[PDB]
Design a binder for this molecule. Structure first.
Ligand SMILES: CC(C)CNc1nccn2c(-c3ccc(C(=O)NC4CC4)cc3)cnc12
Ligand code: NA
Ligand code: NA
Ligand code: NA
Ligand code: NA
Ligand code: NA
Length: 256
């Protein structure tokens, strides 16, 4: 099964992902280069939804040039019936890599954290706050992490483990919200779980996340600097929580 995008032909290799009206495929082109093509069927999409999709594509096309920690978009084809997006193919999502993982080299972790900050910093400079950041939003490629999306288009997902307190109360958003989520990610990568993963019940979990007397646990570890990043990222009050530009200057990423 071959498909054609902007005149060029790509042989399918396998499906990777799915969605309501979205499919992702690993493909090869004429020169045997490998890409991921996303196909979105628009038949059943509202004006607002189309508008959410066109916005994200304009943002990905643009932000590409400002960081290589953002996934590559090589080309796209868009009609009233479909979108095809030719994008960079990664090695594995960060969430899958993290699930099937014994522990992490401290060096690797630091380096993956740097990449997450860079990518999210980039979108914040352009006025985008992602607001639903999770391990699945990052992709490993050549031992680097790349951000795969910006949170803008409509519609493993559902999880609330990464959701900041002020997103629970509010149901405007600030970049401090992405810093909480990134923080839970690095908590996972440090202690092997998210900071509320124990609370199986959903409603106790949401009440634990917002309640200023539920003290989050920070077991001691050799890297005092990583312990500190985490505590600064997981402050419940956005105005106390560390900012991205601050995180970029923190001993944890700069020192050694
Ligand atoms: C082959 C597979 C096991 C590992 N690779 C991958 N796993 C999961 C997702 N992957 C992509 C991928 C890249 C981008 C998008 C995507 O939909 N981005 C939105 C901005 C428009 C969706 C999927 C590109 N490569 C992958
Ligand atoms: Na580390
Ligand atoms: Na998105
Ligand atoms: Na959370
Ligand atoms: Na959690
Ligand atoms: Na940092």
């Amino acid at each position: 099964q071959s498909m054609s995008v902007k005149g060029r032909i790509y042989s399918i290799l396998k499906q990777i992902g799915s969605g309501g009206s979205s499919k992702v495929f690993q493909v090869l082109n004429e020169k045997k280069q490998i890409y991921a093509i996303k196909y979105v069927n628009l038949e059943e999409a509202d004006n607002q939804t189309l508008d959410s999709y066109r916005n994200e594509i304009a943002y990905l096309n643009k932000l590409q040039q400002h960081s290589d920690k953002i996934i590559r978009l090589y080309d796209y084809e868009i009609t009233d019936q479909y979108i095809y997006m030719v994008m960079e193919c990664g090695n594995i999502d960060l969430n899958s890599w993290l699930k099937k993982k014994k522990s992490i080299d401290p060096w690797e972790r630091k380096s993956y954290w740097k990449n997450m900050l860079e990518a999210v910093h980039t979108i914040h400079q352009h006025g985008i706050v992602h607001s639903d950041l999770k391990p699945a939003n990052f992709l490993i490629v050549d031992g680097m992490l790349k951000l795969i999306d910006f949170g803008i288009a409509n519609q493993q997902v559902g999880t609330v483990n990464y959701m900041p307190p002020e997103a629970i109360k509010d149901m405007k958003i600030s970049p401090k919200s992405d810093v909480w989520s990134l923080g839970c990610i690095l908590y996972y990568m440090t202690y092997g779980k998210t900071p509320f993963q124990q609370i199986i019940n959903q409603i106790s979990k949401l009440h634990a996340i917002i309640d200023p007397n539920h003290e989050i646990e920070f077991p001691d570890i050799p890297e005092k600097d990583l312990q500190d990043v985490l505590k600064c990222c997981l402050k419940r009050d956005p105005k106390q929580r560390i900012s991205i530009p601050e995180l970029l200057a923190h001993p944890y990423v700069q020192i050694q």
